[PDB]
Amino acid sequence: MYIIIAGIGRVGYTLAKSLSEKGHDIVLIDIDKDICKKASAEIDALVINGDCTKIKTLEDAGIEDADMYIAVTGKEEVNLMSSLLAKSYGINKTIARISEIEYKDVFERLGVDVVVSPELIAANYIEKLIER
Amino acid sequence: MYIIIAGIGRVGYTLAKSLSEKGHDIVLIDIDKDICKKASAEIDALVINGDCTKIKTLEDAGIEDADMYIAVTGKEEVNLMSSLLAKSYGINKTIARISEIEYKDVFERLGVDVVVSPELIAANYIEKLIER
Amino acid sequence: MYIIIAGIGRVGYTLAKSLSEKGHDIVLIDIDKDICKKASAEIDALVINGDCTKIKTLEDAGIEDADMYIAVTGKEEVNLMSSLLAKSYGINKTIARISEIEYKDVFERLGVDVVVSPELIAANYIEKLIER
Amino acid sequence: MYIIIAGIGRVGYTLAKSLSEKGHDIVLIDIDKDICKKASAEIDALVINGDCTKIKTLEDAGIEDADMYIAVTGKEEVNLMSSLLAKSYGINKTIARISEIEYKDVFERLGVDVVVSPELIAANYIEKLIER
Amino acid sequence: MYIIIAGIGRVGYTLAKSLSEKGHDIVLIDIDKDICKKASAEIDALVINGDCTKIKTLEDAGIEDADMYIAVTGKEEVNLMSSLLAKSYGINKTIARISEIEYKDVFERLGVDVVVSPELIAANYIEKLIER
Amino acid sequence: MYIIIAGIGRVGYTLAKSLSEKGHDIVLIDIDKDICKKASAEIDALVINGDCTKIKTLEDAGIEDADMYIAVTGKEEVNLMSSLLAKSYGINKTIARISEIEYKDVFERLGVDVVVSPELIAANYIEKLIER
Amino acid sequence: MYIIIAGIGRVGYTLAKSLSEKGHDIVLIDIDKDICKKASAEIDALVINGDCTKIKTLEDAGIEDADMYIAVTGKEEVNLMSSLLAKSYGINKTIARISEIEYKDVFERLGVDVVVSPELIAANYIEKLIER
Amino acid sequence: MYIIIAGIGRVGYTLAKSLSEKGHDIVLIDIDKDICKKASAEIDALVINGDCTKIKTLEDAGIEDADMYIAVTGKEEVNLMSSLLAKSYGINKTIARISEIEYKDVFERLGVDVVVSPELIAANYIEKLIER
Numbered sequence A, B, C, D, E, F, G, H: 001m002y003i004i005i006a007g008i009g010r011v012g013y014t015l016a017k018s019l020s021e022k023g024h025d026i027v028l029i030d031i032d033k034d035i036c037k038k039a040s041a042e043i044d045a046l047v048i049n050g051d052c053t054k055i056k057t058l059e060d061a062g063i064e065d066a067d068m069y070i071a072v073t074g075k076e077e078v079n080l081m082s083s084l085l086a087k088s089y090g091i092n093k094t095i096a097r098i099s100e101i102e103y104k105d106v107f108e109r110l111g112v113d114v115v116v117s118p119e120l121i122a123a124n125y126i127e128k129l130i131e132r
C-alpha cells in the first residue's frame, strides 16, 4: 500500500523528500541514528533506525504492506540482499542501486526489478546533452 | 575441479587446510592482507587479497572455471551477494554462511545452492550426542 | 533428571526448543532479561535470569541435581568457568562451546566432557558435502 | 574539433567509449597510469596521463582549441577547478560532476555550463519511474 | 569601507579580533550559530549567520561594497567558491585559505589574490628559525 | 649533530624536503608505513616507521645525537610528550606544534623551546599583509 | 576538595566508585558517551563526556578549583598531557597512568606529581606475597 | 623448590628479574621467541619458549616439582587454563592475572590461590595515596 526507502543519503534523502511532497506514503530506513533524526525532523514519513538486511528491521518498516522497496544504500550487497528479501515477502516492485556498472544485468536476472547505476545514468545523461 | 573459498577466518581457514591436505585445488580470498600473508605461508593453495564481492577478485580467482564457490565471511550480506555473483558465472555448487537462523530457508530460496548456519549445525550436533 | 543450558542465543535457543519438544526436561539460564522473556514465551521450561558464572544462579537452576550442564554462551571462558563450576558440584556431563579452536584440547584436558566449536563443526560439515 | 574529458572512471570511461564509438573526436585525461593504459587500449582517442588541475596537462590535452571540457573526476573540487581553468582558456562549453548537491547552483553561478550530480539524477530518474 | 571575513575559527576569530581592535570595520560570516554568538559578544562588528557559499548570505554581508573578502573556513573548496563569488561582485581583493598545498597556484591562477596554507607557512616559519 | 622530524604531513614533509635540500642531516619519523615509503623514496634522509612517543622509536631515530627535535604530528599530545621526552635526552632545541592556540604559552612554560600554531601564524600573516 | 578522574575504564571506574562511597566529591571525564551514560546511572558523581586534553573539558570539570587530577586513560600520551594541563591550572597533586615501564621515572621528572604503572604495582604486589 | 612464571611482559619480566635477583630459583615461559631471548639476556634463569596452555611446555618447565606457578600472561583465560593445568599436577600455590575484575571470585572459587588484577590493585593504590 506504500513505499519503503533504505539508505537516506544523497540519493535516498532527495528521493524521499520529493516523494513525501508528491503525496506518497513513505517509510525510511537507515542504519545511522543521527541520519534518522535529521530525516524524521525534515520529512513527513516514519523512520526506522536499523540494518535493512535484517528481517526485523524490514518488519518494523511494514515490509508486508508495501508495494515498493527501494534500496539506495552506498553498499550494493546491502541493496542486493535487501531487495531479494523484500521480493520474497510479496513486494511487487523492487529497486536496487549498484556501484558496479557491470552488475546492472546481473542484478536484474537475480530478480531485482530495477537496478540503478547513478554513474551509468550520469553518463548517458551527459551524452544525451551533447546529442542536442 | 577448483574450489574457491572466501573468508579465511575460523571456518574458512580450517576448511582450507582440511581440503588441501586431501589433494583438492583451492584458492582463498580475503580482504585482510595479513591473514593473506599468514595463509600463503602455511597452506598449499592460491591466496588472493581482495573483496570477494568484486568482479576482478572473483575472476582473478578463476571463478569462470571453478567447480565450487564457498563464502564463509562473517557478513552474510557478503556471502549471499558473492555466491549469487558466482552462480552468475555458471557455478551451481554455491555454499554461503549466514549469521541469522531465519535465512536458513530464505537464502536457499534466494538462489544459493547450500546455506550453512554453524550455530544451527552446532545445536543439532549437541542434540545428536544427547540422543545417544 | 534434567539438563541445564546457559546461553539461549543462536545456539541455545534452537537446542532448547528442540530438546524441550522431544520431551526432555530442561532448565534455562540467560543473563539477558529480554532473551529470558523470549524463551519463556516460546519454550516450555524453567527459565532463570542470571549470570551462569555465579554460584547462586546455578543453585537457582538446580545445579545440585541436574544430569547435565550445557554452556553455549557466546563467551568462551564463561562457558569454561561455569562448566568447571558445574563440575565442582558433581555434574559428570558438561558440554561447553568454544570460540578459539586451539583451546579445544585444553578444555577437554580440564574435564569438559564435550567441547563444541560451531566453526570447526561447520567446516567439517561443508567438507562432507564436498566428499559427497 | 574535439572534446576533452577528465576522469575516466565509472562515469568517464562509459561516456568516452559511447562517444568515441558514435564517431567523436575526443582527448582523455587521467592522473592514473593504469587507467590510461586501459582506456587507450579499448578506446580510440588521445590519452594524457596527468593532473587535470595542472595547466601543462591541459595544454598537452589541447585545451587551447578544445570545443568542450568535461570533468567527471571523483573529486568535486578538481572538476570545478579544472573546469574554471578550461573556462579561462576560452572554452565556452563546460560540464562538471559534483558530489555535494548543495553546491549545484554555486557551480552554475561560477560559469559551469552543465552541473551533473549522479546521485541527484538517479533520484529523480527513480521518481520518474514512479510517475509512469 | 569594510572587510568581510568568512570562517571564524582558529584562524578567523584571531584575525577578526586583532583587526577589529586595531580599529577596522569588519563583517563576520559563520554558518555556526554558537560561534556567531561568541564572536559578536567578544568582537565589535557585524555578524551574519549563514553559508558563505550562498549569495543571500554574501548580499547580507554587504559583498556589494566590501573592499576585501577573506575566506578562512576549514573547507578549502568553500573558501575557493565563496572567494570566486566575491570576485564576481567586483571585489578585487580576495584571500583564501587552502588545505592541499598542491592547489596553491591553481587558486592563484583562478584569481584568488592571496592564498594561505597555514601548514605551508608553519613549515617555512620553522625553517626560518633554523636559518637564524 | 643533526635534526629529527616527527610527523611527515603537510607541515613535516615540506619542512623535511626543504631542509634536506638546504644541506641538512635529517631523520624522519612517522607512524604510517605508507607515508614512510613515500618520504624515503622522495627525500634524502633516514626514515623510521613508528610511534615517536615511544623511547625505542626515538632511540632508533638517533635521539642521542640530535641537536634538534621537531614534532609536527597532527596530535598536540604526541608532539607535547615527544618534545618533553627529547628534552630529557639532552637535546637542546625542541619544536612542538599545537592545534589549540590557547596552549602556546602553556607548552612553553612546560619546557618546549618553540611552540608552533600554524593557525595563529596564518592569522598574523594575513594581518601583516593587510598592514602593507 | 574536588577530585577529577579522567578515563572511566577498569582503573577509573573502580577508583570512582570507591572514592565516592567514601564521601569524596568527584567528577569523571570520558570521551565515550555510552560509558558516560552507564557511569552517570550508577555513580554518585558528576559525569562529563569530553576529551580531557581540551581546555573546555577540564574547565567544565572545575579544574580551576579541583584539589586533585587523576588521568587513568589507556593512552599515557593523554594522561601525561592532560595532567600537565592540570598542573598548569595550579593542581599540584596530579596522578598519571603510564603503559611503558620506562617512563615510571621520566614522567615524574617530566612534571607530573605521581606516575602510576599498574603493571609494576602488580609485580611488586606479587613479590610481597611471595616474601611472606 | 622453584617458581614457574608464564608471561614475561610488563608484569612477568619485572617480577622475574626482581625474584631472581633476590636469590629465588625461577623458570620462565613465553610463547614469543624475542621475549624469551630478552629474558635469557637479562635474567639468570631457565627460559622455555612455548605455549603455557600445552602440557608439554609445562613438563619442560618442571611443572611436576615446582613449588609455585605464576601466570601473568596478557590473556585472562590463558592464565586461568594454565593455572588449572598446573593445579592438576599437584601445584598447591597458583597466582593468576586477570583482565575482567568481575571474574576474580570465580577464579578463586575454582582454585586459583591468588588472583591479581593490575587495574584493581592500581585503583586501590591510588586510593591509598589520597587517604594519605
Ligand SMILES: NC(=O)c1ccc[n+]([C@@H]2O[C@H](COP(=O)([O-])OP(=O)(O)OC[C@H]3O[C@@H](n4cnc5c(N)ncnc54)[C@H](O)[C@@H]3O)[C@@H](O)[C@H]2O)c1
Pocket (backbone or CB within 6 Å): A006, A007, A008, A009, A010, A011, A012, A029, A030, A031, A032, A035, A050, A051, A052, A053, A072, A073, A074, A075, A078, D099, D100, D119
Ligand atoms: N560527497 C559527499 O559528501 C559524500 C558524503 C558521504 C559519502 N559519500 C559517498 O557517497 C557514495 C554513495 O552516497 P549515497 O547517496 O548513497 O549516500 P551515502 O553513501 O552517504 O550513505 C548511504 C546511506 O544508507 C545508510 N544505510 C541504511 N541502511 C544501511 C545498511 N544496512 N548498510 C549501510 N548503510 C545503510 C547509511 O547509513 C547512509 O546514510 C559513497 O560511495 C561515498 O563515497 C559522499
Ligand SMILES: NC(=O)c1ccc[n+]([C@@H]2O[C@H](COP(=O)([O-])OP(=O)(O)OC[C@H]3O[C@@H](n4cnc5c(N)ncnc54)[C@H](O)[C@@H]3O)[C@@H](O)[C@H]2O)c1
Pocket (backbone or CB within 6 Å): B006, B007, B008, B009, B010, B011, B012, B029, B030, B031, B032, B035, B050, B051, B052, B053, B072, B073, B074, B075, B078, B099, C074, C076, C099, C119
Ligand atoms: N568470540 C570471538 O573471539 C570472536 C572473535 C572474532 C570474531 N568473532 C565472531 O565470530 C565469527 C567469526 O567467524 P570466522 O572466524 O570464521 O570469520 P570472521 O568473522 O573472523 O572473518 C570473516 C573473514 O572474511 C574475510 N573477507 C574476505 N573477503 C571479504 C569481504 N569482501 N568482505 C568482508 N570480509 C571479507 C574477512 O577479512 C575475515 O578474515 C563472526 O561472525 C564474529 O562476530 C568472535
Ligand SMILES: NC(=O)c1ccc[n+]([C@@H]2O[C@H](COP(=O)([O-])OP(=O)(O)OC[C@H]3O[C@@H](n4cnc5c(N)ncnc54)[C@H](O)[C@@H]3O)[C@@H](O)[C@H]2O)c1
Pocket (backbone or CB within 6 Å): B099, B100, B119, C006, C007, C008, C009, C010, C011, C012, C029, C030, C031, C032, C035, C050, C051, C052, C053, C072, C073, C074, C075, C078
Ligand atoms: N552477526 C550477528 O548478527 C550476530 C548477532 C547476534 C550475536 N552475534 C554473535 O554470536 C556469537 C555468540 O552467539 P550465541 O549463540 O551465544 O548467541 P548470542 O551471541 O546472540 O548471545 C549469547 C547469549 O548468552 C547469554 N548469556 C547467558 N549467560 C551469560 C553470561 N554469564 N555472560 C554472557 N552471556 C551470557 C547472553 O545474554 C546471550 O543470550 C557472538 O560472537 C556474537 O557476536 C552475532
Ligand SMILES: NC(=O)c1ccc[n+]([C@@H]2O[C@H](COP(=O)([O-])OP(=O)(O)OC[C@H]3O[C@@H](n4cnc5c(N)ncnc54)[C@H](O)[C@@H]3O)[C@@H](O)[C@H]2O)c1
Pocket (backbone or CB within 6 Å): A099, A119, D006, D007, D008, D009, D010, D011, D012, D029, D030, D031, D032, D035, D050, D051, D052, D053, D072, D073, D074, D075, D078
Ligand atoms: N564502492 C566502491 O568500490 C568504490 C570503488 C571506487 C571508487 N568508489 C567511489 O566512487 C566515486 C566516484 O568514482 P568514479 O569511478 O566515477 O571516479 P573515481 O573517484 O573512482 O576516480 C576519479 C578518476 O579521475 C581520475 N583523474 C584524472 N585526473 C585527476 C585529477 N587531477 N585528480 C584526481 N583524479 C583524477 C582518477 O585517476 C580516477 O580514475 C569515488 O569518489 C568513490 O567514493 C567507490
Ligand SMILES: NC(=O)c1ccc[n+]([C@@H]2O[C@H](COP(=O)([O-])OP(=O)(O)OC[C@H]3O[C@@H](n4cnc5c(N)ncnc54)[C@H](O)[C@@H]3O)[C@@H](O)[C@H]2O)c1
Pocket (backbone or CB within 6 Å): E006, E007, E008, E009, E010, E011, E012, E029, E030, E031, E032, E035, E050, E051, E052, E053, E072, E073, E074, E075, E078, F099, F119
Ligand atoms: N584537533 C582538533 O581538535 C580539531 C578541532 C576542530 C577542528 N580541527 C581541524 O582544524 C581544521 C580547521 O579548523 P579552524 O578552526 O580554522 O576551522 P574549522 O574547520 O574548525 O571551522 C570552519 C569554520 O568556518 C565556519 N563557516 C562559515 N561559513 C561556512 C560555510 N559556508 N561552510 C563551512 N564552514 C563555514 C564554520 O562554521 C566554522 O566555525 C579543520 O578542518 C579540522 O581538521 C581540529
Ligand SMILES: NC(=O)c1ccc[n+]([C@@H]2O[C@H](COP(=O)([O-])OP(=O)(O)OC[C@H]3O[C@@H](n4cnc5c(N)ncnc54)[C@H](O)[C@@H]3O)[C@@H](O)[C@H]2O)c1
Pocket (backbone or CB within 6 Å): E099, E100, E119, F006, F007, F008, F009, F010, F011, F012, F029, F030, F031, F032, F035, F050, F051, F052, F053, F072, F073, F074, F075, F078
Ligand atoms: N587537506 C588534507 O588533505 C588533509 C589530509 C589529512 C589530514 N588533514 C588534516 O591535517 C591536519 C594536520 O595535518 P599535518 O600537516 O600535520 O599532517 P597530518 O595530520 O595529515 O598527519 C600527521 C602525520 O604525523 C604522523 N605521525 C608520526 N608519528 C605519529 C604519532 N606518534 N601519532 C600520530 N601521528 C604520527 C601521522 O601518521 C601523519 O603522517 C589535521 O588536523 C587533519 O584534519 C588534512
Ligand SMILES: NC(=O)c1ccc[n+]([C@@H]2O[C@H](COP(=O)([O-])OP(=O)(O)OC[C@H]3O[C@@H](n4cnc5c(N)ncnc54)[C@H](O)[C@@H]3O)[C@@H](O)[C@H]2O)c1
Pocket (backbone or CB within 6 Å): G006, G007, G008, G009, G010, G011, G012, G029, G030, G031, G032, G035, G050, G051, G052, G053, G072, G073, G074, G075, G078, G099, H074, H076, H099, H119
Ligand atoms: N584484556 C582485555 O580485555 C582488555 C580489554 C580492553 C582494554 N584492554 C587493555 O587494558 C587497558 C585497559 O585499561 P582501562 O580499562 O582502565 O582503560 P581503557 O583502556 O579501557 O579506557 C581508557 C578510557 O579513558 C577514556 N577517555 C577519556 N578521555 C579520553 C581522551 N581524551 N582520550 C582517550 N581516552 C579517553 C576512554 O574512552 C576509555 O573509557 C588498556 O591499556 C588496553 O590495552 C585490555
Ligand SMILES: NC(=O)c1ccc[n+]([C@@H]2O[C@H](COP(=O)([O-])OP(=O)(O)OC[C@H]3O[C@@H](n4cnc5c(N)ncnc54)[C@H](O)[C@@H]3O)[C@@H](O)[C@H]2O)c1
Pocket (backbone or CB within 6 Å): G099, G100, G119, H006, H007, H008, H009, H010, H011, H012, H029, H030, H031, H032, H035, H050, H051, H052, H053, H072, H073, H074, H075, H078
Ligand atoms: N599500551 C601498550 O603499549 C601495550 C604494549 C604492549 C602490551 N600491551 C598490553 O599489555 C597487556 C598485557 O601485558 P603483559 O604484562 O602480559 O605483557 P604483554 O602484553 O606485552 O605480553 C603478554 C606476554 O605473555 C606472553 N605469553 C606467554 N605464554 C603465552 C600464551 N600461551 N599466550 C599468550 N601470551 C603468552 C606473550 O608472548 C607476551 O610476552 C595487554 O592488554 C596488551 O595489549 C600494551
